[PDB]
Structure formats: C-alpha cells, structure tokens
From Swiss-Prot:
This is Botulinum neurotoxin type B. Changing S1195Y: Increased binding of heavy chain to host SYT2, no effect on toxicity. D-galactose binds at I1236, H1237. Residues 440-853 are annotated as: Translocation domain (TD). InterPro entries: Bot/tetX_LC (IPR000395), Clostridium_toxin_transloc (IPR036248), ConA-like_dom_sf (IPR013320), Kunitz_inhibitor_STI-like_sf (IPR011065), Toxin_rcpt-bd_C (IPR013104), Toxin_rcpt-bd_N (IPR012928), Toxin_trans (IPR012500).
Length: 1287
C-alpha cells in the first residue's frame, strides 16, 4: 500500500526523511531547502517557487503572466514557519484524501514506482548514467553552514509552493540540452508549484448554480482534485510519455478572438471529458506512434545495458527488473526483453485515458468544470482545510453529515459560505482587451470573454497522404476512452517489484535548462468601430456612482448617456419600467413590471412551426447583436433564411483534405496476399471515413461550438443585466417616498428577485436548448456534408483503383476475379453514417446529437419557400433554385406552372446527404390546386398524362405526373424497373372536395411500400419490394411536360422533401400547421377578401343556393342547376349562380378597395340587386328560435341588426366559416347564426315545404359540439369566379 509520512516543519534534519535538498534548478549552487519526504520518491518543499521569476514579480502589478487566468498575487503566503507547517499538514491531508480511494492510490503507486530511467538520450545505449540533473538530486548531509558533505538521492517528484500567481498550479519537467527525458520514454524528476488554499472557481453553463443570480453562484474546486490533476502530468512525465505533437493554437487575427498559449494534446487528455475529441484521430495515432517508438528505444537499451559508470554500487539486474515492470516489457526464458503489443496498449490507454481529471472527479464524487474551454473566474480562498468540519479526507467539502453530499452542495458557493472567502480584486490581475473607437470611447473586455476560435493549423493533414495497402496492413483505431472499473480492479497494473534504494552518488553535473518567465501587459488596446456582443452587453450596464437610470430601446443613447440603459425587451415593457406612480399604486406597479419581465424573458420559448422551426429565441439578436448584424431587422425572419450561420461571430475555414491515394502491392501468383490486399484496402477505406469525421468533430468543438458557448454565456449576462436594471429602478422609485409612505407600501425585495431570477432561469434553459440546436445543425448541415463530398470523391477513385487491380491480377484470381469484382462495388456502395458517440462519450454532447436526430424537421432536405419575389431552399442544405420567367409567384407561397416552355423551376440538389440509404427512404409533401376539366376537352383530360415534377439521374429516380383527375407517383430503380401509386378523385360528384381546390399531398417511401396521403388521410398504397436502388438526388424539374392543352396550368405551394418516411402522425400535424391562418378562406381555399364578389355555398345544403325572392325581401333557397351536356365521364352542380355577394368592412373608413378578412372581424354582408348594392339584415324583435333574414337596400334602421361577425368554430382545417349576429360588438348577446330553415306553406292553391335564408339561435349550441359537425346549415363558403373552374 501507500504510506503517508508524518512530520512538522520544525522537526530536525535527519538526512533521510527530512533533508536539506539542493533543487534541480539551483544549478548546484545557491542555498538548500528544507524538504520533507511525504512518501517514497516524493518530496514536499513548503516554500515559494522562485526559479525563473524575479522577486518583484511576486507583487501585483500592471502585468500578468498568463493571459487566460484571473491571477492572484500575495507575497506573504508561506513567509513564516507556522505558515510552512500549515502547508505540510495540508499536503499530508490532501495525499491521505487521495489514497482514500483505490483509483487515487493506484495513481500514487504508479508515480512512486515510475522511477526515471537512469540516463537520457545522450547516455550510450550500453550505459546507466545517474549523474544527470533529471535522475539525481543532492542533499546536504554535513553540518549547518558548510556544504562540505553531500549525498545523492533518486527522486520522482518534488512539490513546491506557488510561484508569483497562487492559483496558477503547474507541473514542470527537466530539460537538458534542449531535450526532455520526460518526453522520450526515460522520464525524469518532476517538479510542481502548488497551492491548496486558493482554489479556482467555475459554473455549469447549461445549468443554474443553486438557481441563483442575485445570489453567489458557481462552485469552487476541491484542492485534492487539483492536486491529482497535476499528479497526472507527473505520471505522464515519469513514464516519458509527455510527448509534444501538433497543438491546438487559437486564431488571433480578429479583435474578438481569444488570445492564448498553444494547447498540447497531453493537456486535453489529462482534463478528459470532451477535450480529447478536439484532438483529431490523426494526431491521436501520431502521439501513440511517438510514445511506442520511445518505448522501443528503452526496451532496446535494457537489452544492451551492462554497466553504470556514475555509480559502481548500482545493481544492474535490480534495475533491469524494475524497468521491465515499469514499461510492462516481456521477457523470454533467456532474458530477452521485447514489447508485447497487448500489455503496451493497455498501459498506454491507462495513462492517457484512464487517469483523467474527469474520471477522477466522477469517482471521488467531486464536481469540476465542464470543459477545458470554459470561462475562468476569480479564485476564492479556502478558510481551513484542516478543520474536519469543513473538509474531510473521506468526502472533501461534500460531507453527508451536513447534507452537503447531494448535488455537490459542499462546493456550491451560494451554499457553503463558511468554507471560503472572496478575494480583494486589488490583488487580482486580469488580461484585458481595450476596445477603442476612432474618436474616443473605450471599453474593457476580459480576454476570457472573447471567442476562442481554433486556427486551421491546429489540425493534422495526415489524411491527404498516400497509404500502401498490403496483405498485412490493418486498421488503426485509438480509443480516446477507457473502462475506469477494470483499471481500479486491475491485478497487475500496480508493480510488485521492490523499489531501489534512493541513496546513490552525488550529482556533479548540474547542467540544466532553467525557464525564464516574465509578465506582459495586462491590457492590450485595439481599435474598431464595431458594435458587437461586447459593446451591446456593455450598453446594458451602468456606473456604481449612479442610482437613477431609465431604460431605452436605443442602443446609441444607452452608450451615450450614463443614466440610460439598453433593453432588448418590448417597447411596452420599457415604458412601464420607466413609469412613475403614486405610493398607493407602487405595489401594483411592482407586481406588474415584474410580471412583465417574466413574460418578456419567456418569449424565449417562441415556436415557428409554419417555417419548420420548432424553437426560436426572438430577442437574441437585439440583446447581443452577435454574428452578422443580428440586431437589425427581424431576427426570426433572418434566422429562417440563413439559420445558425448568422449567429456565428466568425465562419471558420475548415480543413477537409483530399484523402490521399492508395498503393496496392501486387503478389504475382498468389491467391491470398492478393485477396487480402483487397479486403484490407476496403477496411482501410472505412478508417479513412471514421477518421475524416473525427477531424470534423474536432474542428466543430473548437471553432464552432465554442462560439455558441460564448453566445449562451452572453445571454446569461444580458438577461442578468436587465434584471439588475429593473432592480435598480424599483429601489430608486421606492426610496423616493418618505418613511411614512414606505411603511404603508407592501413590498418584498427577496421576492422580486426570486420572480426575476426565476424567469431568467426558464429563459436560460430555452436559450441553451436553442443554441445547442444551432450548433448541432451547423455540424450536420454546414460541416459533415463538406466532408462527405471528399469522402465520396475518394471512394470513386479507390473504386477504379481496386477494379484496375482485380484486373491486372485477373489471372491469379481466376474464377473469382468477378466475385470480388462486385464484392468491391457492394462495399464502396454503403457509406458510413456519421455518429457522434463514436468520436466522444460526453453525455451532454451525445444528448445534443440525439435530440437533433429525434426532431423530424431536421430530416428536411429541401424546402422551397418564397422570399423577395423568388423561391429558395430554406432546408439549410444549399440547394440551388432556378426560377424561370414563366413561373408566377406570390407572397402566399403559391406558384403557378403554365403550358409555356419557360414555366419551369430547376432545383440542383445537394449530392452530399446520406440520401441513398439503399432501399429508398424518403418523403415529399406539398399543396396543389388542379383546375377543372374544360367540358369540351374531357376526352384529352382523361387521356393525356403529363409530368409536372421530374427528378431523374442516370435513368433512375422519381416523378410526379397528372392524367386528368389522377395524380401519379412513379419510381424507376437503377434496373429500370418501374412502379407507381396514384390518387384519383371522382369527377361525377355534385360537389367535389378536390377539383380546383387547394389540397395537401404527401408521399412516403420505405423499403416495402409507397403511400399517398391526401389532407392527412391515407388514400393509396403500393407494394414496392422489387424496386431496387432509386437515385433520388438528381436534378428536380418543375414543369408541365406532355400533350397538354395550351390552357393547362397547376398551382403549387410548400414543396418540401424529407429523407425519411413521415408517419401518419407527422403528416396530420404538417397538414394542420400548413392549413393554419388568421384569415378565413374562400371555396377554393385562398384567403377570403373584402370587396370581392362571391356566390354562396352551404355545407349543410350542397345543392342549394340563395336567390332574392321576387315579391318579398327574403332569400329563397333553390336547387343548383347541373351539368347539361351528355358526357358519361362528368357531372357537377353549377357554382356560379344565386346572388352575387360582397363582404364589406365595418370599422376604419379607409375606402372600399380590397383587403383580407380575418376571424372575429365585423362586417356587412351585402349583395348586388340590379345596379344597387343591398344588405343582409335581421329584424331585432323576434321571439322564436329562428326567423327569415331581411334583404333590402342599404340603410340604417332602428329595428334591424346590420352588423355581422365572421367566425370559425371548427378547430380542424376547413374552408367553411360561420356568420354571427350579435346585439353589438361589445355585447355578449348572441342574436344567432345565419343558416337555412325549412318552413311549411299551405296556401289556397299550393301546399308544400320551402327552405329560406335564415338566422337561428339553435346553431349557437351545435357549433360547440365535438367533433365539429361540418354538416351544420350554418357553415358557409364563398365562391368567386376562378379561371380554374368553368361551367
Ligand atoms: Zn493541466
Ligand atoms: Zn478558452
């Protein structure tokens, strides 16, 4: 096990466990340091790290060492013996906490046993040289004051206290002659600067730290995890695997980009979590290859080591045995050491992926930051880690015996306040960027606030290189993952070979490279007249010396006047917030303005289903003005058009290399080595696919998802500022009253803050769900497709490459040259689907991905919508749309295809979508209005089939065509095999629900069937087992093509395509979402208009129509006349009959031109009688359930109701509408609904029943029934003359 020693600072120097050490960076000179051996091979020196630093650097200055850290300075730390001892006692306690769990102890055991190899690159293979600064360190044995006697010792780790910046912990390695033994397999003495007291702070971005903003928020770090984080670097250094490779360097070309040091992969592996994914699979293998090569050298030396010049007392065997166990080398019965790939692999993965900060945090139930790239905060000071009441060895701060175990409560700042203290900002130093405008107003922005955008250089181009395929060549996949359980349960992970004695010859060669550090300006002034996120956030703040502010929607006034604060919330909200009231009305105003704030913030849950967007945060652009000038115009519209790309502050330039070529080695007269070279090139191809996706993901995570992170944090801020301004105003107005008045004002500020911070939290969750959605969308639509392209390009090349190979060897393949001929076409056919869970295992990211893929709307690969007199694809896949001069377009998203040759639309689809899933899986939905047949052209109508939408590529694909009253869906697989399904509507109906009327079509295709849906209802099905591969992404031509009549035309709307099969459920919903409108519709399905002539139709009496009775002011109901000719193919009732009505507006007298009729509108229902315009009226004084309507010239009578309110009681789609008579707008007295009633007439001559145009109260209760009864006599539809219907 691991034994932790005990001692006090003042304990006597015994030259064994309490020595006088000569530190590695002292160069064999200077004074010694009282060092204590906390454990074998590990020393603690409770003194400030001063190597490379100037004495004055320890004081806070106008400079800083690291640009990405809030640096704390305090030169008095450890300046007394008691302070040094408290340090020792804390270190001892932290180590005990560490070994308190199997994982932590094994980490300690690996470190104690991971003794540096004796010597480095310089040392001859045959030797062991201990006289080098990275292997040996001296201790002064002799009496005080005289360095007369020295003793050498072996060591693995020396831990010092902090250097200038206390919260800047660092593991340092020993370089000698520009080389590091710790980076070449040898290993070497590792050093560290560490501070247990002043720990870092962080807060889960996509979450609320104690659901508080007006409260302290975020969590503070557990010093034991901080220590283990450094201990992991030590582990790496001790095993000589701390190699350097291609680093993640940040782009710094723009003022909004975050400046920082290059980040090595070793760092990201140490942190763990998702960061490893930022290291492409290419560089993962590189690093692996370097380390393995490093171990080959060591394993070779162990076979050649014969002596140790530096120390004749060294026992060569004991050391060969130790090293053999360290590097897990294997040994035969002779003593020949060699590398076992298995054992090496497991050791490598253990060290780079098992021991990570994330795994360790999860294991010790300690909470930590969610990513390497996450805004750093001011550190806090831990009161007393030595008091078992605040921090214990077993649980740290999360002591269950204080209900501090659950949810990491012990580390929650807003909860465990008696455990820490904030720090004097006067001792903190932060690198700032001073953004100045050419004038000059300037603002300070902490480098941590800017966007971290990885530079293109950060990524490897190893994909663009050629690869020799041989019967050997195999797949190379490195798992940036490890099973922490096995590691914890590993029997032979922890060596059981005795550790060599640490005493040895003194060091005489003190040669070593000592780093020199120095502060750099903490402020960098830049010039820009831009007003982006930083400026917009700034305009929402106000000075401490100011207490009277007012809100404004004017960003420019907010920046100018100190007493003005910018607000991205509504105009009404802003007025109410600036409103001053009487003390007696203050409470009420507080309730109101607060409630309003919540409403405004909650607009973050806005839906936009009609534009196929389930969630949109409308105020994001006004709040931050991030990306492409998002504060201007309507954000929602802008988002509908360009999507997530508009929110990005910068569009990266991706690295998507042309996959290098393949070199297949031929084996003449050889059936195996040849077939192998084939299979291996096939599987290698798959590795190129997986690897290319890794490169994409790594780039997404460090150039795109980081920007969206900043946006999320910007919104958290924006919202908080608003809450702070309203807070400031409420306090101000309240304090303007006298104490007497205040006593009678009932107000509770904790409450106000609660309601406010609550609304903030609801919006934060919306905003996060929204932004993550945008991030995943950008990955899938703007990145993955660009990779797929190249990967496909690669495939083809490799295709002819393998075919040309299976050919040159045709002979040696004999009766199979044709078998593995297809075996190649059948493999290079199905492409590898992108799956994020492969390139990472971060729970948060996987969830983002799964959520994205569960939302059907993301399966839209084409969505033609109108925008500025044109049609464009808004699916976000970039389809190029060509609309020619013959296509008629309007803002109701309707387009007309005529018989003219120039009436066509050309759509070039995106070839880079996993469309060809191999069995045809996709859907097409759209609305269409097909004109009525010309009665004299009935023969050709039922005979000529004409294509309307054609999508072919290599004689394969789909097509939509029309033959009279039938719409047909046709598929043609690669084998030319044709299949169809169709929907035909009846053309002998008195009243058709389809002829010349807008209706919704949806066609779904899966492996088995082809289904046609009409208005959500399934109408037709076709078994399509046969039909093989169908090339569905060819060019799409929208044009009438066939033997048509010059007058033939077709109107279309909302054409879109999904690369999946829509369910009846999805389709029903789409129908309802696209049927929705605030206005009513006419018979054909178009918007209802004012001042437009219409004949009336009654859904309850289809074959009836209204005629003004000759003798009386009543409207009689007569039977519609029918189709007169003799065709056996057609029958219908006349629609252009009865009175010609016209709907007139009631309110605002803005003449009688034309406009749209909306639900709940008040209107006059008039009609034309000869040269006059008459009106529909209701005699005010009837007492029966119903009565006949009064029709007469326009006039104002005291005895008649002349005002109607157009209604819509049906919740489901319908072109029917109802007409209500009320006592008057404001009233709630419902006179009745217009309909048709049957009366009995018995005169001196005639005796019969007759229906009249009436009004009935009876309808009032029928319209409430569910399902809505469409057959009620109160349902009407307006039929205007339409070129699409002639009779
Ligand atoms: Zn680190
Ligand atoms: Zn960062």
């Amino acid at each position: 096990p691991v034994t932790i020693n005990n001692f006090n600072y003042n304990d006597p120097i015994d030259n064994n466990n309490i020595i006088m050490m000569e530190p590695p960076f002292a160069r064999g000179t200077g004074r010694y340091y009282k060092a204590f051996k906390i454990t074998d091979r590990i020393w603690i020196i409770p003194e400030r790290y001063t190597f490379g630093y100037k004495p004055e650097d320890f004081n806070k200055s106008s400079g800083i060492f690291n640009r990405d850290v809030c640096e704390y300075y305090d030169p008095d730390y450890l300046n007394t013996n008691d302070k040094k001892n408290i340090f020792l006692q804390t270190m001892i306690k932290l180590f005990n906490r560490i070994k308190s769990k199997p994982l932590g102890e094994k980490l300690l055991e690996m470190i104690i046993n991971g003794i540096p190899y004796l010597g480095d690159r310089r040392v001859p293979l045959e030797e062991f040289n201990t006289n080098i600064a990275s292997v040996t360190v001296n201790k002064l044995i002799s009496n005080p004051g005289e360095v007369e006697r020295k003793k050498g010792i072996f060591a693995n780790l020396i831990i010092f206290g902090p250097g200038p910046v206390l919260n800047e912990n660092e593991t340092i390695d020993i370089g000698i002659q520009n080389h590091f033994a710790s980076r070449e397999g040898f290993g070497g003495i590792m050093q560290m600067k560490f501070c247990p007291e002043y720990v870092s702070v962080f807060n889960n971005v996509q979450e609320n730290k104690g659901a508080s903003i007006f409260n302290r928020r975020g969590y503070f770090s557990d010093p034991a995890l901080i220590l283990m984080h450094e201990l992991i670097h030590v582990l790496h250094g001790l095993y000589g695997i701390k190699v350097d490779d291609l680093p993640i360097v940040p782009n710094e070309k723009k003022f909004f980009m975050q400046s920082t040091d290059a980040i090595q992969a070793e760092e990201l592996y140490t942190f763990g979590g998702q960061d490893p994914s930022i290291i492409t699979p290419s560089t993962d293998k590189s690093i692996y290859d370097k380390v393995l090569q490093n171990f080959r050298g060591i394993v070779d030396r162990l076979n050649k080591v014969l002596v140790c010049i530096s120390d004749p007392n060294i026992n060569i065997n004991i050391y060969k045995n130790k090293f053999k166990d360290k590097y897990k080398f294997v040994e035969d019965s002779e003593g020949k050491y060699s590398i076992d790939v298995e054992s090496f692999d497991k050791l490598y993965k253990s060290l780079m992926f098992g021991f990570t900060e994330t795994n360790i945090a999860e294991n010790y139930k300690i909470k930590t930051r969610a990513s390497y790239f996450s805004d750093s905060l001011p550190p806090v000071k831990i009161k007393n880690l030595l008091d078992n009441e605040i921090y214990t060895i077993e649980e740290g701060f999360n002591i269950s015996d204080k209900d501090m175990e659950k949810e990491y409560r012990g580390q929650n700042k807003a909860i465990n306040k008696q455990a820490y203290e904030e720090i004097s900002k006067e001792h903190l130093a932060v690198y700032k960027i001073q953004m100045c405008k050419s004038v000059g107003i300037c603002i300070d922005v902490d480098n941590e606030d800017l966007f971290f955008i990885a530079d293109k250089n950060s990524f490897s181009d190893d994909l663009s290189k050629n690869e020799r395929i041989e019967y050997n060549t195999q797949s190379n996949y490195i798992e940036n993952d490890f099973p922490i359980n096995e590691l914890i349960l590993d029997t032979d992970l922890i060596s059981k070979i005795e550790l060599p004695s640490e005493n040895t010859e003194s060091l005489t060669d003190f040669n070593v490279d000592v780093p020199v550090y120095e502060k750099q300006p903490a402020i960098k002034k830049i010039f820009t007249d831009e007003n982006t996120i930083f400026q917009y956030l700034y305009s929402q703040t106000f000075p401490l010396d100011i207490r009277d502010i007012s809100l404004t929607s004017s960003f420019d006034d907010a920046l100018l006047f100190s007493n003005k604060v910018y607000s991205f919330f509504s105009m009404d909200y802003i007025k109410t917030a600036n409103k001053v009231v009487e003390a007696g009305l203050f409470a009420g105003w507080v309730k109101q303005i607060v409630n309003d704030f919540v409403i405004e913030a909650n607009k973050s849950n806005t839906m936009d289903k009609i534009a196929d967007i389930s969630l949109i945060v409308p105020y994001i652009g006004l709040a931050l003005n991030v990306g492409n000038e998002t504060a201007k115009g309507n954000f929602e519209n802008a988002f509908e058009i360009a999507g997530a790309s508009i929110l990005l502050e910068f569009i990266p330039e991706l690295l998507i290399p042309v996959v290098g070529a393949f070199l297949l080695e031929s084996y003449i007269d050889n059936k195996n080595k040849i077939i192998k070279t084939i299979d291996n090139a096939l599987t290698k191809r798959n590795e190129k696919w997986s690897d290319m996706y890794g490169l994409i993901v790594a780039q997404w995570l460090s150039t795109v998802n980081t920007q969206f992170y900043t946006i999320k944090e910007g919104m958290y801020k924006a919202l908080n500022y608003q809450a702070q301004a309203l807070e400031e105003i409420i306090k101000y107005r309240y304090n303007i009253y006298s104490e007497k008045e205040k006593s009678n004002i009932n107000i509770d500020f904790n409450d106000i803050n609660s309601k406010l911070n609550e609304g903030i939290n609801q919006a934060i969750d919306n905003i996060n769900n929204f932004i993550n959605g945008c991030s995943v969308s950008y990955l899938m639509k703007k990145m993955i497709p660009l990779a797929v392209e190249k990967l496909l390009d690669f495939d083809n090349t490799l295709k002819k490459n393998l075919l040309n190979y299976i050919d040159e060897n045709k002979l040696y393949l004999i009766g199979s040259a044709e078998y593995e001929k297809s075996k190649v076409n059948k493999y290079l056919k199905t492409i590898m689907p992108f799956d994020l869970s492969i390139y990472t295992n971060d729970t948060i990211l996987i969830e983002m991905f799964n959520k994205y893929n569960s939302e059907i709307l993301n399966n839209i690969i084409l969505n033609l919508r109108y925008k500025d007199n044109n049609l464009i694809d808004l699916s976000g896949y970039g389809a190029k749309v060509e609309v020619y001069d013959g296509v008629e377009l309007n803002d109701k998203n309707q387009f007309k295809l005529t018989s003219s040759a120039n009436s066509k639309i050309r759509v070039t689809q995106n070839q880079n979508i996993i469309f060809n899933s191999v069995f045809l899986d996709f859907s097409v939905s759209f609305w269409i209005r097909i004109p009525k047949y010309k009665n004299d052209g009935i023969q050709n109508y039922i005979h000529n089939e004409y294509t309307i939408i054609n999508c072919m590529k290599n004689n394969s694909g789909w097509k939509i065509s029309i033959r009279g009253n039938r719409i047909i869906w046709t598929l043609i697989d690669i084998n030319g095999k044709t299949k169809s399904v169709f929907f035909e509507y009846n053309i002998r109906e008195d009243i058709s629900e389809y002829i010349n009327r807008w209706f919704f079509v949806t066609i779904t295709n899966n492996l088995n069937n082809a289904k046609i849906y009409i208005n959500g209802k399934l109408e037709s099905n076709t078994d399509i087992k046969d039909i093989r591969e169908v090339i569905a992404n060819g060019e799409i031509i929208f044009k009438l093509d066939g033997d048509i009549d010059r007058t033939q035309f077709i109107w279309m709307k909302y054409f879109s395509i999904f690369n999946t099969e829509l369910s009846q459920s999805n389709i029903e919903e789409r129908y309802k979402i696209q049927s929705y409108s605030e206005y009513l519709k006419d018979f054909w399905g178009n918007p209802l208009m004012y001042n437009k002539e219409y004949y009336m139709f009654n859904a309850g009496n289809k074959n009836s129509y209204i005629k003004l009775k000759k003798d009386s002011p009543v409207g009689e109901i007569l039977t519609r006349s029918k189709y007169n000719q003799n065709s056996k193919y057609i029958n219908y009732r006349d629609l252009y009959i009865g009175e010609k009505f016209i709907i007139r507006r009631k309110s605002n007298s803005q003449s009688i031109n034309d406009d749209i009729v909306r639900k709940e509108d008040y209107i006059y229902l008039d009609f034309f009688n000869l040269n006059q315009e008459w009106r529909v009226y209701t005699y005010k004084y009837f007492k029966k359930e119903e009565e006949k309507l009064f029709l007469a010239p326009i006039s104002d009578s005291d005895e008649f109701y002349n005002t109607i309110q157009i209604k819509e009681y049906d919740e489901q789609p319908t072109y029917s509408c109802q007409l209500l008579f009320k006592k008057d707008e404001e009233s709630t007295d419902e006179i009745g609904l217009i309909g048709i009633h049957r009366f009995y007439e018995s005169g001196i001559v005639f005796e019969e029943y007759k229906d009249y145009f009436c009004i009935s109260k009876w309808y009032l209760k029928e319209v409430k029934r569910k399902p809505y009864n469409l057959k009620l006599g109160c349902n009407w539809q307006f039929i205007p003359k339409d070129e699409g219907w002639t009779e």
